[PDB]
Design a protein around this ligand. Sequence first.
Ligand SMILES: [Cl-]
Length: 127
Amino acid sequence: KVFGRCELAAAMKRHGLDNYRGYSLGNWVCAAKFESNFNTQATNRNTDGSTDYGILQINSRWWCNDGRTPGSRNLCNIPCSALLSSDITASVNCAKKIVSDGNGMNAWVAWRNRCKGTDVQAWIRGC
Ligand SMILES: [Cl-]
């Protein structure tokens, strides 16, 4: 599915991301916009043989297992395929683990480059 902005904000809020580990909701909405364009089925292959999966583009070298990535660590203990569901539960649960790992939201390249340092509250304005 392709979420609307406020629709995703509300779902992310129900799943406990607002202010999670120090990151207000607009961070998570901005990250999804620029990672997946709000599409739960987005996928992107990388040079190291990994793939990024789903609404938050979770990576198969470190976080989810896709069975085809060298050096897999599966730190979210989840098949990557579950991260392509239209239900965001598995992606949120893994995102919570990622953002707790010690480098905050910097794991999300698009957030780091395109959201961090901007007024991210604008992403929930009008919702
Ligand atoms: Cl998989």
